[PDB]
Design a protein around this ligand. Structure first.
Ligand code: K
Ligand code: MG
Ligand code: MG
Ligand code: MG
Ligand code: MG
Ligand code: MG
Ligand code: MG
Ligand code: MG
Ligand code: MG
Ligand code: MG
Ligand code: MG
Ligand code: MG
Ligand code: MG
Ligand code: MG
Ligand code: MG
Ligand code: MG
Ligand code: MG
Ligand code: MG
Ligand code: MG
Ligand code: MG
Ligand code: MG
Ligand code: MG
Ligand code: MG
Ligand code: MG
Ligand code: MG
Ligand code: MG
Ligand code: MG
Ligand code: MG
Ligand code: MG
Ligand code: MG
Ligand code: MG
Ligand code: MG
Lengths: 48, 106, 127, 61, 172, 197
RNA sequence: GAAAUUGUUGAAAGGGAAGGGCAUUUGAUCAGA
RNA sequence: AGAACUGGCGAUGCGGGAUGAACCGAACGUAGAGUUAAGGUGCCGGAAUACACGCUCAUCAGACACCACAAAAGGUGUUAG
RNA sequence: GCCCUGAAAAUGGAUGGCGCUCAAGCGUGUUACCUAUACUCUACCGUCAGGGUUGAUAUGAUGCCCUGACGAGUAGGCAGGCGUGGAGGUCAGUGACGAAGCCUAGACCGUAAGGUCGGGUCGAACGGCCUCUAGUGCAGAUCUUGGUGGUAGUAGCAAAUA
RNA sequence: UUUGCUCCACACAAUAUAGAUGGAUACGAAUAAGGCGUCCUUGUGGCGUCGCUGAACCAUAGCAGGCUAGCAACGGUGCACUUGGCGGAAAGGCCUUGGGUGCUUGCUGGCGAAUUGCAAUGUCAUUUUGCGUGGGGAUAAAUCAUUUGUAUACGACUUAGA
């Protein structure tokens, strides 16, 4: 039978699996779209 | 010459079979250049050799042969039926065989 | 050395092993016919073991013949061996399992003298 | 397959030898088997058949 | 049913002592063999007259060949057929060289367009249309225009081999 | 008849081409399929996109990583069509599938090799004129394939290089046709023509 | 001094069971002549 | 759920219907060869991507009886009357 | 007629799948081809039936031989055989120069129940044949007794202050 | 490192082969259109020609292909060098310069073959590995243990330590 009362599911299914990251430094999986008329510059920086 | 071949190339396709039951005693051979049973009638009775290699040398060679012969045509597309002294292993489905020109009637 | 015989044809050389004798140790390999109501082997479904039947019976001309063409005859002594004196082309003597070594030597010598084939001439030989 | 009109492997239903192990009766059966086979006299055949009969089928005369 | 032949079938309604020499009825039957021709003859005679095969006899069955098998003709065919919900009469026109070929085309066309099996079709009449402009179906009239020519675009040549090395062409 | 047969998949009616390739593989012929993005499927693009979405909605309910995998690339769509027709769960089917390679475009190993076609699978020969058809590259892009642009650019570069190669080959072929245009009235040429050559 | 069950050695195979039937390849082993 | 006749399953394997007690075909000693049944011949899968006439384009096409469903009513869709 | 609307159900999924669009779809027709333990022929096994053959060296006339046909099967009936403990007779049988038992992807015979042999272990009895006899054949019975596993080096060995 | 590692060449051993037995012989695009050749006013141009399958093209003769004598012509082809360029989609290949060298069946000769006994794949390929002989090249790390807490049930992770 149906849930008998609606409620949103707990948690976000797009952040699965809830596992340990493979590295302590998280990977940059997408860099800004290149604008090839601009001067050469870094798109990211590392800090603590 | 560069070529020394005195046999027609062929391929061991499968055993004689129904949908779900096979007959290892009879093998199906696709002979190169043969597209009709009328053509395959020429190759009826010709000897066939499956030639394979082994690690262990036996009687002065590391090459072994399974002998058979063409018995009849199969289907409408030039495939033939073949019987061998010992049935082909069935790992040779798709393997090459040699259809010799003897016994010759030319 | 034996009488001429047709080619010996064995219709079924594979042993008729009892169903599930490979599945359970308590089920011996000695053939037993399945009597079960639902037995797939008894009902002879395709893909199952074959059962012994009279059709497998060997040709009467080659039945009981060893590959040498002789029928095996068990012998316990020289008197037993000498029953094959006029039948050396049809029977081959097999010395009984419980014959001592010296009696085996005597039997072998007598069989050699009489031209009687011995199927197990190497039993209890000098080591 | 054969549509059998009669029972297959049906034994004749008549004795072909005495059930007795009497050696003398067996010798008589052999003699009258020879006579029935090689004389063509109906008497020999009926005597041979009578020699097979059981005790209740041979009432005293 | 198969490649058709036309037979004349003449039957008798077997004579009695009161009525010798009965009226000798005849039919033109399209069938693949003489057994089927006689069966169809008796079927239609039972549809038309008080007679059956047991009370009649086949006096003659003769194959009728096309008079001019190599002259292209327009045929008008009147047929009666049973649909899934009724019986209907239709008139069709077929261009062919013989009555048997026209009838084979008619059976194929009825099966294709009306799902009418052989058992459901009665051939009422097949007659040659002697004069053009008595052809009343456009799909035949279009083949009677003067100096009719037409191309065969997109020719598809059948390959004898599995693989081709040329990227073939459909020109014609 | 060749150790490796390279099929140019452009316009090749993916199902019929898959049948041909599966039979060749099971018969023991090594097949490499190039330009899988240019394959065709009969039926409208919307029809085939709906079919792919019906395929996409099929997945193991309790774990989607177990269910059917929906490969988006045209080469993998062709490979799925071919695996569904090869007995891929047996060792023989595994060997037959190992005898096969499918590519988008014509990668460097095969860009300088002869490409063949399968007339019984060719769209122009099989499909009735006017029937609508789908292009595998467009369908794959619509269902999530990411490399249509890269394959198109590399195909354009390869076609430029191949056109230069063919211009050179055509010039050499013209030279050869001139060379055998003469020496055709010589006695050797007349004897060859009398013998059919 | 059996079997169940177990250790060692040797051989062999092993992508979500294993075992089996027909057939043959390969390896090992062996009778008969 | 209950009767009539017959054939079957139970008691029955085999080929086909993917799969299935009953359907189709055919009933069974052990083998060889040939021919077939029902069913099939794109590939899985043995067997013509055979031949011939047409019909159908479906943004839920359709694809062999038992059998695994679809109706009334409608459509200048298209085809034939 | 085909197609479409009518046409809505719950895990993701089924012309069997792939896939198929002048089809690999539908209706129809013609051939060719594939294959059942089915049909035809032959061989072998057995059963049944009909016969021939005591004229001897023919010791197997329930023997030998000829001919034809047949062979599915639960419950069940019958027949012919295999094996076990013990008993009478016999082989003047086997055996401490090794009986019985046991082990043996070693060999032979039988369609089979089973039988025989080789090798290892072992130590004192045992077998073939003709008969007699039965407390005579196990996979089951939540069977009986005894022994042994996987679970598994697992659960756990944490109340009572240390 | 009880003389270790890697690469190359050769020899000898093993090891197998999803299956060589002349050549996978490279435009692109269209198919109710194209390919090729040629010409011009260079085009969506004119003219000619072709397809109707690769049944093609190349190659192909020589003790599985030997040993030699010439003729003709500066061609074809293999080998190891060599000049340079191009190719990154998986480039690992394509093209090219020069000389050397072997063969040349383009043509004409001389010698040899046998007895594998009338056939038996009658062994000619490539896949890895090992070993020995020479040459070329290089001279580290990881883990346990200790430590850290940005981590953690245990593993694991993250740190530090000549
Ligand atoms: K057991
Ligand atoms: Mg709700
Ligand atoms: Mg046996
Ligand atoms: Mg039952
Ligand atoms: Mg029968
Ligand atoms: Mg994604
Ligand atoms: Mg003890
Ligand atoms: Mg044990
Ligand atoms: Mg696992
Ligand atoms: Mg019951
Ligand atoms: Mg039945
Ligand atoms: Mg079904
Ligand atoms: Mg096939
Ligand atoms: Mg309606
Ligand atoms: Mg509908
Ligand atoms: Mg089909
Ligand atoms: Mg049809
Ligand atoms: Mg048979
Ligand atoms: Mg008798
Ligand atoms: Mg029976
Ligand atoms: Mg007792
Ligand atoms: Mg002992
Ligand atoms: Mg054992
Ligand atoms: Mg003692
Ligand atoms: Mg008891
Ligand atoms: Mg027990
Ligand atoms: Mg029981
Ligand atoms: Mg119990
Ligand atoms: Mg207990
Ligand atoms: Mg614990
Ligand atoms: Mg506790
Ligand atoms: Mg405490």
């Amino acid at each position: 039978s149906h849930r008998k009362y609606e409620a949103p599911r707990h948690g976000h299914l797009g952040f699965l699996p809830r596992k340990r990251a493979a590295s302590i430094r998280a990977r940059v999986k997408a860099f800004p779209k290149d604008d090839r008329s601009k001067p050469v510059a870094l798109t990211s920086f590392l800090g603590y | 010459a560069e070529s020394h071949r005195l046999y027609v190339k062929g391929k061991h396709l499968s055993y004689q079979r129904s949908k779900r039951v096979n007959n290892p005693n009879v093998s199906l051979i696709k002979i190169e250049g043969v597209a009709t049973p009328q053509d395959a009638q020429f190759y009826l009775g010709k000897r066939i050799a499956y030639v394979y290699r082994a690690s262990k040398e036996v009687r002065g060679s590391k090459i072994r042969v399974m002998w058979g012969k063409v018995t009849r045509t199969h289907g409408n597309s030039g495939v033939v039926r073949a019987t061998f002294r010992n049935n082909l292993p069935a790992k040779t489905f798709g393997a090459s065989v040699r259809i010799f020109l003897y016994p010759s009637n030319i | 050395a034996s009488l001429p015989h047709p080619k010996i044809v064995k219709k079924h050389t594979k042993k008729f092993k009892r169903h599930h004798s490979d599945r359970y140790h308590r089920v011996a390999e000695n053939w037993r016919k399945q009597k079960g109501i639902d037995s797939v082997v008894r009902r002879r479904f395709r893909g199952n073991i074959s059962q012994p039947k009279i059709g497998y019976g060997s040709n009467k001309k080659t039945k009981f013949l060893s590959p040498s063409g002789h029928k095996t005859f068990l012998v316990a002594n020289v008197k037993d061996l000498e029953t094959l004196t006029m039948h050396t082309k049809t029977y081959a003597a097999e010395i009984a399992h419980n014959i001592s070594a010296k009696n085996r030597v005597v039997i072998l010598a007598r069989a050699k003298a009489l031209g009687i084939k011995v199927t197990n001439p190497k039993g209890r030989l000098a080591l | 397959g054969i549509d059998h009109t009669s029972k297959q492997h049906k034994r004749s239903g008549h004795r072909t030898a005495p059930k007795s192990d009497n050696v003398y009766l067996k010798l008589l059966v052999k003699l009258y088997t020879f006579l029935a086979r090689r004389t063509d006299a109906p008497f020999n055949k009926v005597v041979l058949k009578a020699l097979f009969l059981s005790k209740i089928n041979r009432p005293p005369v | 049913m198969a490649h058709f032949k036309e037979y004349q079938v003449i039957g008798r309604r077997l004579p009695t002592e009161s009525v010798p020499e009965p009226k000798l009825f005849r039919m033109r039957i399209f069938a693949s063999n003489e057994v089927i021709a006689k069966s169809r003859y008796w079927y239609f005679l039972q549809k038309l007259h008080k007679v059956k095969k047991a009370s009649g006899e086949i006096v003659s069955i003769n194959q009728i060949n096309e008079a001019h098998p190599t002259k292209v003709k327009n045929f008008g065919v009147w047929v009666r057929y049973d649909s899934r919900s009724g019986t209907h009469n239709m008139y069709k026109e077929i261009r062919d060289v013989s009555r048997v070929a026209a009838v084979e085309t008619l059976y194929q066309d009825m099966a294709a367009r009306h799902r009418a099996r052989f058992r459901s079709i009665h051939i009422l009449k097949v007659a040659e249309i002697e004069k053009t402009a008595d052809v009343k179906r456009q799909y035949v009239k279009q083949f009677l225009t003067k100096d009719l020519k037409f191309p065969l675009p997109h020719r598809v040549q059948k390959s004898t081999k599995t693989f081709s090395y040329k990227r073939p062409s459909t020109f014609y | 008849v060749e150790p490796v047969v390279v099929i140019d998949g452009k316009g090749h009616l993916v199902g019929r081409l898959a049948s041909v390739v599966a039979k060749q593989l099971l018969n023991g012929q090594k097949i490499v399929v190039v330009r899988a993005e240019e394959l065709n499927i009969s039926g409208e693009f919307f029809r085939n996109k709906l079919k792919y979405h019906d395929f996409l909605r099929k997945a193991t309910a309790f774990n989607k990583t177990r269910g059917p995998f929906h490969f988006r690339a045209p080469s993998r769509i062709f490979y799925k069509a071919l695996r569904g027709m090869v007995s891929h769960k047996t060792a023989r089917g595994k060997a037959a599938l190992e005898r096969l390679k499918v590519f988008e475009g014509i990668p460097p190993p095969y860009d300088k090799k002869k490409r063949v076609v399968v007339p019984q699978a060719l769209r122009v020969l099989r499909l009735k004129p006017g029937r609508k058809y789908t292009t595998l590259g467009k369908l794959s892009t619509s269902v999530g394939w990411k490399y249509e642009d890269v394959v198109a650019k590399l195909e354009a570069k390869r076609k430029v290089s191949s056109a230069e190669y063919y211009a050179k080959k055509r010039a050499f072929t013209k030279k050869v046709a001139s060379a055998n245009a003469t020496a055709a009235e010589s006695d050797v040429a007349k004897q060859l023509a009398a013998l059919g050559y």
